[PDB]
Amino acid sequence: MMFIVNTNVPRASVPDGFLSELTQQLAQATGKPPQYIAVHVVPDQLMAFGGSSEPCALCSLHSIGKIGGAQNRSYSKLLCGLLAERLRISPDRVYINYYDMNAANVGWNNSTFA
């Protein structure tokens, strides 16, 4: 599983420990063991949301399964909550794209997961 956050919040506002927090909370919310979980945060980006350059984030969560209607609602509350508390980004200036990956289309260590 992979979680990516792109944000115009400066690097200095990302707390020490944020990646660890994300890895642990995602493991807890999805049930995936943390060992299979990757996390990627990209600060200081040039972006706009609704024409405004106030703090925002564009994110993506890729997973083989564990994606659907109810789950994604629950992840969006979790992740917007984390972005608001830790990076001070308003939840209405966050988008998160969810991707249910086919195991045949995910490579890892010289093979795929199919």
Residues at the interface with its own copies (CB under 8 A) = 2, 4, 6, 11, 14, 19-20, 22-24, 34-43, 45-51, 53, 56, 58-59, 62, 67-69, 72-73, 75-77, 79-81, 91-92, 94-101, 104-112, 114
Q: How far is the CB of 86 from its own copies (least distance, A)?
A: 13
CA distance 110 to 53: 41
Closer of 30 and 75 to its own copies (Cβ) = 75
Cα-flanking dihedrals φ and ψ of residue 110, to 5°? 65, 15
Whether residue 82 contacts residue 17, with contact meaning beta carbons closer than 8 Å, is answered with: no
Q: How far apart are CA 76 and CA 99, in angstroms?
A: 13
Cβ proximity to its own copies: between 38 and 65 the closer is 38
